[PDB]
Ligand binder design. Structure first.
Ligand code: 0KB
Ligand code: 0KB
Ligand code: CL
Ligand code: CL
Ligand code: CL
Ligand code: CL
Ligand code: CL
Ligand code: CL
Ligand code: MG
Ligand code: MG
Ligand code: MG
Ligand code: MG
Ligand code: MG
Ligand code: MG
Lengths: 228, 228
């Protein structure tokens, strides 16, 4: 549906939708922009990520509310409506995964872009995993793992330990280990090593970069406090 | 689209959507329930009102953000996107007005139901008026006025001055006068007379009714403080 709108107008409208807190519109504008076929700049990758994280965040919050109610119940209505919200969530995740596979990741050659998109691939498979069950759950969990691991391998080779994308990737992979993979020790080890290596590299940063890095290190510390 | 779902299941799902903060779903479930053709109970009228007030509230907030940006700007993109949000808002208002006209108001014979639906008719014409301009704006403003006035005439004849529906109707009609009709003196007179007549009737109320009434009287007092 956004095929007739200029790329620059889609990006401008994504920014207006963010100001208006219209995240579904923001995601549709950014999907339109990706579908123009050109690579995304750093600012535009962040617009894509903010749009979809807010849309899926709403769906995840609702799914948790409904799943809770359903668990306590255990007519068909709660299960039906939880399944409706679940399907809509799966559709948003599949859309994002589709944009990454067609063709954002394959054209991303710089570390900052390739790590960003692989982290996104891990996060959306992780959201699919939260609602998955059984073996289905296993192949989805391994997809999330694989994407996070490739991103980590690149980030460790190509970025300093304070780089915010590297820090956020490590934060979310630690969450994957604690909440999805039933590996709390791996989660704690990852968050602690990430935190310690960033602290040792802070002396290299300007005031503004220091603020960016320490904000995410505080997220790692908040989890380590929750987990220990 | 809700034609195949039982009325009771639509109401149950509206309540689940409210818990999940899924207001668009809640509005669609309640639209489905109205379209079954049966009158709505007090609880169900309140579900209808909560659903649509939250959906239109989101649209109004976005419209104000975009209109502000547009005013400061004065390419086509801001105007285009403000118009998109405006059209979607107008559509929600027209949907609500349609449900009231087909056939909620005509079947509503009790004061509590008829005043509730006429107040709703005033509020949704008032939302249309907020985005209207010119003469178009005049006929919409008079529709809102007419609906509020019929509700007020019934409420004054049939309900005590502390009745929360009567109080909320007077609150919103005062807002209509201050914000839409450019009649701040009528707004202040209405809110003050409403407040004073309710205060004089509080002695008749139980503890729980007193809490319900005084909550809305505090809203009248908050406006009177903003307006004087
Ligand atoms: O509360 C959180 C914390 O999650 C994270 C913490 C650190 C890093 C990454 C995440 P996330 O990608 O799981 O959102 N996420 C979240 C995000 C959106 C919605 C809900 C809800 F509780 F409502 F389901 C939870
Ligand atoms: O802040 C308000 C206060 O409005 C009222 C006050 C008393 C009685 C009725 C109303 P309302 O029916 O105009 O919402 N309404 C409102 C409701 C939703 C959204 C926005 C936004 F500022 F974001 F556009 C404003
Ligand atoms: Cl459903
Ligand atoms: Cl289905
Ligand atoms: Cl490449
Ligand atoms: Cl638009
Ligand atoms: Cl158009
Ligand atoms: Cl009647
Ligand atoms: Mg072009
Ligand atoms: Mg399912
Ligand atoms: Mg490239
Ligand atoms: Mg039936
Ligand atoms: Mg228009
Ligand atoms: Mg009747």
């Amino acid at each position: 549906a956004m095929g007739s709108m200029e790329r620059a107008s889609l990006i401008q409208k994504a920014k207006l939708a963010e100001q208006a807190e219209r995240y579904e519109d923001m995601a549709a504008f950014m999907k339109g922009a990706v579908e123009k076929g050109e690579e995304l700049s750093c600012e535009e990758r962040n617009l894509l990520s903010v749009a979809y994280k807010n849309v899926v965040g709403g769906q995840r919050a609702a799914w948790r509310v409904l799943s809770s109610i359903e668990q306590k119940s255990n007519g068909p209505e709660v299960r039906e409506y939880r399944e409706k919200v679940e399907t809509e969530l799966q559709g948003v995740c599949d859309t994002v995964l589709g944009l990454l596979d067609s063709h954002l990741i394959k054209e991303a050659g710089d570390a900052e872009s390739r790590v960003f998109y692989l982290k996104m691939k891990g996060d959306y498979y992780r959201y699919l995993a939260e609602v998955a069950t059984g073996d289905d759950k296993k192949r989805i969990i391994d997809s999330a793992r694989s994407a996070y691991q490739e991103a980590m391998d690149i980030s460790k080779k190509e970025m300093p330990p304070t780089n915010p994308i590297r820090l956020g990737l490590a934060l979310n992979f630690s969450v994957f280990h604690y909440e999805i993979a039933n590996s709390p020790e791996e989660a704690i080890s990852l968050a602690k090593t990430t935190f310690d290596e960033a602290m040792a590299d802070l002396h290299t940063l300007s005031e503004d970069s220091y603020k960016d890095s320490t904000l995410i290190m505080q997220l790692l510390r908040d989890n380590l406090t929750l987990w220990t």
